């Protein structure tokens, strides 16, 4: 009887870029609009039921983080719904801010273009009425040219925001990829904590029980109600049996 902590892998060929790393294949990504792709899922790494040290469980489809058990009754993958959803909840609120924060680009814009709007209307004024007078000729010519210099300049903000957009993605992609690695380890530690010495650490993300742990025992480990004293002894002889 053995329990493993692991995570999700799938047929995704989506690649994002962090800063130190490029073309990193992830299971779940999201495509902003300007070549910007933010990772939502995690590193796509598909592999005796191994744990998470060298493995992303393709056979695990019910979530991001979860366990793969094996006892007398049978074996199978099972996603931790609580963990997976906290990750999804947090990442969602972040991805949204990015969409929401960049929404200052237009709010402020709405003005430069009700104003751009007012000017080339004012320019079409002078083009239609111009059908001393040619002092007003190169006068208008001076302003129309200043309108282009003005738009190029406003567009400089688009150019210089490109790069706002580009770095925010690479950085949030790392905070994210790190965030997963966190939650995964936390789950392993939470299990390692309960089991203590009633189970052997294999070092591959799996724990080898010294006592037979049925499906109910597994659920107890999952929902954090593992009774250590209950099996303490039978693990204890088993450690010394060998």
């Amino acid at each position: 009887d053995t329990i493993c902590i692991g995570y999700h892998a799938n047929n995704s060929t989506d690649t994002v870029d962090t800063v130190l790393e490029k073309n990193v294949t992830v299971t779940h990504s999201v495509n902003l609009g300007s070549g910007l792709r933010m990772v939502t899922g995690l590193r796509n790494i598909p592999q005796a039921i191994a744990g998470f040290i060298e493995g992303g469980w393709t056979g695990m489809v019910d979530g991001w983080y979860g366990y793969h058990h094996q006892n007398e009754q049978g074996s199978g993958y099972a996603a931790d719904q609580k963990s997976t959803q906290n990750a999804i909840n947090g990442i969602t609120n972040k991805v949204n801010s990015v969409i929401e924060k960049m929404g200052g680009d237009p709010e402020w814009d709405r003005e430069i273009n009700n104003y751009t709007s007012i000017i080339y209307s004012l320019i079409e004024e002078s083009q239609n009425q111009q059908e001393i007078v040619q002092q007003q000729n190169n006068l208008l010519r001076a302003i129309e040219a200043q309108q282009h210099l003005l738009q190029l300049t406003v567009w400089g903000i688009k150019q210089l925001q490109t790069y706002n957009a580009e770095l925010l993605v690479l950085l949030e992609n790392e905070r994210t990829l790190d965030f997963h690695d966190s939650n995964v380890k936390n789950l392993y530690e939470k299990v390692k904590s309960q089991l203590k010495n009633n189970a052997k650490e294999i070092g591959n993300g799996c724990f080898e029980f010294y006592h037979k742990c049925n499906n109910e025992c597994m659920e107890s480990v999952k929902n954090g109600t593992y009774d250590y004293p209950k099996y303490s002894e039978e693990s204890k002889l088993n450690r010394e049996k060998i």
Partner: antibody
Amino acid sequence: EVQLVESGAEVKKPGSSVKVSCKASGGPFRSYAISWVRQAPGQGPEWMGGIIPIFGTTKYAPKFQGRVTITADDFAGTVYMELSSLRSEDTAMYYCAKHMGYQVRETMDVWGKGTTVTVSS
Amino acid sequence: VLTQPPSVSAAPGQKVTISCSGSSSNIGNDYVSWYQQLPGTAPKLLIYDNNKRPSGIPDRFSGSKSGTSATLGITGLQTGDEANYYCATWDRRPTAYVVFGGGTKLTVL
């Protein structure tokens, strides 16, 4: 709290298809699942299907399993329900409803107002 | 499908219970939700997880689940409570799906 807005009423012929949308406020990305629940007059509600955020997994009621398709546009903060092979008894009020977590379950806390689809010859 | 009483009746201040009979595969091992529907309105969540209340729902409503049956209780009954009441849960047995009760039309006598 989240407000769920659904597309306008639809009139369709038997055998044709209809595609309804639902847009969630805030977001646009969601951290909870969304299901489509229908009500014919004057009957009890029927759960049709749902979609999980990020995973995009869909589960469908077996009664509609086969001719319903639930898709999501996460950037648009919009999900869609497309029901094909329409019959006259597909005439109903259709609600989008969000769940509390990413998992489709009996608990839908917020509901769209419903839009009417009429199927007649 | 879950079996509800077609209708149940009582007066202001008085109390009434709406039952929901299912089987082992649905009610037997899943959580039960309750919804209220006035005419011309979307279903509104009353109870979830057998007996929990969303904010906005007063302690005049309450729920219970026993084995294969579940119960909605409404005390201090008022005029606005006149509506249709549906129970809901998870039916794992077929292919897993959410199932609703036939519905109970409440009449405030």
